[PDB]
Enzyme design. Structure first.
Site, mmCIF file in Angstrom:
data_model
loop_
_atom_site.group_PDB
_atom_site.id
_atom_site.type_symbol
_atom_site.label_atom_id
_atom_site.label_comp_id
_atom_site.label_asym_id
_atom_site.label_seq_id
_atom_site.Cartn_x
_atom_site.Cartn_y
_atom_site.Cartn_z
ATOM 1 N N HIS A 133 0.806 -1.215 0.000
ATOM 2 C CA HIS A 133 0.000 0.000 0.000
ATOM 3 C C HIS A 133 0.843 1.271 0.000
ATOM 4 O O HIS A 133 0.294 2.358 -0.220
ATOM 5 C CB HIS A 133 -0.911 0.055 1.224
ATOM 6 C CG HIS A 133 -1.970 -0.993 1.226
ATOM 7 N ND1 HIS A 133 -2.858 -1.136 0.184
ATOM 8 C CD2 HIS A 133 -2.257 -1.972 2.111
ATOM 9 C CE1 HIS A 133 -3.689 -2.130 0.455
ATOM 10 N NE2 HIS A 133 -3.340 -2.657 1.615
ATOM 11 N N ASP A 171 -2.143 -10.846 -2.093
ATOM 12 C CA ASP A 171 -2.803 -10.258 -0.934
ATOM 13 C C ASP A 171 -4.254 -9.932 -1.299
ATOM 14 O O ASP A 171 -4.561 -9.580 -2.450
ATOM 15 C CB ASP A 171 -2.014 -8.999 -0.499
ATOM 16 C CG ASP A 171 -2.518 -8.386 0.805
ATOM 17 O OD1 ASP A 171 -3.590 -7.796 0.744
ATOM 18 O OD2 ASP A 171 -1.858 -8.509 1.841
ATOM 19 N N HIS A 173 -5.988 -7.452 -0.587
ATOM 20 C CA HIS A 173 -6.155 -6.042 -0.886
ATOM 21 C C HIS A 173 -5.367 -5.633 -2.121
ATOM 22 O O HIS A 173 -4.410 -6.295 -2.536
ATOM 23 C CB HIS A 173 -5.721 -5.165 0.280
ATOM 24 C CG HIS A 173 -6.423 -5.490 1.564
ATOM 25 N ND1 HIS A 173 -5.905 -6.374 2.480
ATOM 26 C CD2 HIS A 173 -7.641 -5.136 2.041
ATOM 27 C CE1 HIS A 173 -6.739 -6.520 3.486
ATOM 28 N NE2 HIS A 173 -7.796 -5.771 3.246
ATOM 29 N N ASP A 264 -3.925 -12.919 3.522
ATOM 30 C CA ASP A 264 -5.208 -12.544 4.108
ATOM 31 C C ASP A 264 -6.388 -12.920 3.227
ATOM 32 O O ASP A 264 -7.530 -12.684 3.635
ATOM 33 C CB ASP A 264 -5.272 -11.044 4.428
ATOM 34 C CG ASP A 264 -4.575 -10.188 3.413
ATOM 35 O OD1 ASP A 264 -4.248 -10.693 2.309
ATOM 36 O OD2 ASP A 264 -4.446 -9.001 3.725
ATOM 37 N N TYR A 304 -3.499 -12.296 8.626
ATOM 38 C CA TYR A 304 -3.687 -11.951 10.030
ATOM 39 C C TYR A 304 -4.149 -13.099 10.902
ATOM 40 O O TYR A 304 -4.139 -12.939 12.130
ATOM 41 C CB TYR A 304 -4.657 -10.752 10.154
ATOM 42 C CG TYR A 304 -4.130 -9.665 9.306
ATOM 43 C CD1 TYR A 304 -3.023 -8.957 9.719
ATOM 44 C CD2 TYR A 304 -4.620 -9.440 8.029
ATOM 45 C CE1 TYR A 304 -2.434 -7.992 8.907
ATOM 46 C CE2 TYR A 304 -4.049 -8.454 7.211
ATOM 47 C CZ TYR A 304 -2.967 -7.742 7.661
ATOM 48 O OH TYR A 304 -2.373 -6.792 6.852
#
Ligand SMILES: CC(C)N(Cc1ccc(C(=O)NO)cc1)S(=O)(=O)c1cc(F)c(F)c(F)c1F
Ligand SMILES: [K+]
Ligand SMILES: [K+]
Ligand SMILES: [Zn+2]
Length: 353
Positions: A133, A171, A173, A264, A304
């Site tokens: 990010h 990922d 995201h 995740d 996570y």
């Protein structure tokens, strides 16, 4: 025919002073490392030493101001660490955060070096905080510097500027920073799979949609595979790899593959909501190993559920070591997503026609 592995427990020092249960836990990396030991994978790898990225290496992708601001947190008092963190979207900072972000990046540089000098064939990097990010000029979403982007540029800096690097970002995201850093670049192919939900999923930008295909000389070299309509798992990821990731990657013919390997999207992850299994991650890794003469660097991003990420990333290292891959209709919206990407990218990739 060797697999490299980098891990340094110093990267656990980055922590959340105000909420010790924040999901980007120090023990993410120690749990993954422990599971590698437990499965007797660690002794099968060549241990690659961690190191600090230099400030000039950070400038491969980041502005000097961003570098200076994050570096200034090293001696900040809690009040000021809270204030600086709050200037970003989803960032917490401690005095050790800058060091840890340097270690994450330099560890991956050393891993890319070991691959590109032929000391190993492939490698896994168990690092935190994550990177994808992070933008040129700002921190975001638990990330300070864009480890994977920096590694792509570091690799080019010790070979040639046009070395073809594929970054596969699985990922859950969107790696907004990675997309933006390379958006005009035809030397770095960015392919992200990510939950999108029409912009409702973090990081909440239409930049993550399938029609963002790259800019200028980079047009065609940004591939967003966005999911909508709730939970996905192995069938959807295997279909996306079969119809999109692998045909495009083969046509691109990268000289180096980096995986922005957040876990995740794993079954059990509280933040991703998906159900990709460790066996699924194993098959994704095994597919990517067919590229770039097997020159694959797997880089931890998010993820996570401590058990999920430990089992999933270990299954990836098992694949890098040469172990045999382990042993269902698509959700309708996943078919829609894959077909949307196919139509977006057929102008650029003959393998999609
Ligand atoms: C916005 C939401 C998705 N989160 C931030 C996030 C950022 C990046 C990743 C990742 O893995 N990117 O690749 C995962 C989660 S949050 O964790 O649930 C969260 C944590 C907090 F501490 C808060 F105070 C808070 F308001 C909050 F929403
Ligand atoms: K992604
Ligand atoms: K690109
Ligand atoms: Zn994530």
């Amino acid at each position: 025919p060797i697999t490299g592995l980098v891990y340094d427990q110093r990267m656990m020092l980055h922590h959340n002073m105000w909420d010790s249960h924040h999901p980007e836990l120090p023990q993410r990396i120690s749990r993954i490392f422990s599971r590698h030991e437990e499965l007797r994978l660690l002794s099968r790898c060549h241990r690659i030493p961690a190191r600090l990225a230099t400030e000039e290496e950070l400038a491969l992708c980041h502005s000097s101001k961003h570098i200076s601001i994050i570096k200034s947190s090293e001696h900040m008092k809690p009040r000021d660490l809270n204030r600086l963190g709050d200037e970003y979207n989803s960032i917490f900072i401690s005095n050790e955060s800058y060091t840890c972000a340097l270690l994450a990046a330099g560890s991956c540089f050393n891993s890319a070096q070991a691959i590109l000098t032929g000391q190993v064939r492939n490698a896994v990097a168990i690092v935190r905080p994550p990177g994808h990010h992070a933008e040129k000029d700002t921190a975001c979403g638990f990330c300070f510097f864009n480890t994977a982007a920096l590694t792509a540029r570091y690799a080019q800096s010790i070979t040639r500027e046009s070395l073809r690097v594929l970054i596969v970002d699985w990922d859950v995201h969107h790696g907004n920073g990675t997309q933006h850093i390379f958006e005009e670049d035809d030397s770095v192919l960015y392919i992200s799979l990510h939950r999108y939900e029409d912009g409702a999923f973090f990081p909440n930008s239409e930049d993550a949609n399938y029609d963002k295909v790259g800019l200028g000389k980079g047009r065609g070299y940004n591939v967003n595979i966005p999911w909508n309509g709730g939970k996905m798992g192995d069938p959807e990821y295997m279909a996306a790899f079969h119809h999109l990731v692998m045909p495009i990657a083969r046509e691109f013919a990268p000289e180096l593959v980096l995986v922005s390997a957040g876990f995740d999207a794993a079954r059990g992850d509280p933040l991703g909501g998906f159900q990709v299994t460790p066996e699924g991650y194993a098959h994704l890794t095994h597919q990517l190993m067919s590229l770039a003469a097997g020159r694959v660097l797997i880089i931890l991003e998010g993820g996570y559920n401590l058990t999920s990420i430990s089992e999933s990333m270990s299954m990836c290292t098992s694949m890098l070591l040469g172990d045999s891959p382990p042993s269902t209709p698509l959700k309708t919206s996943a078919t829609v997503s894959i077909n949307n990407v196919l139509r977006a990218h057929a102008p650029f990739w003959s393998s999609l026609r």
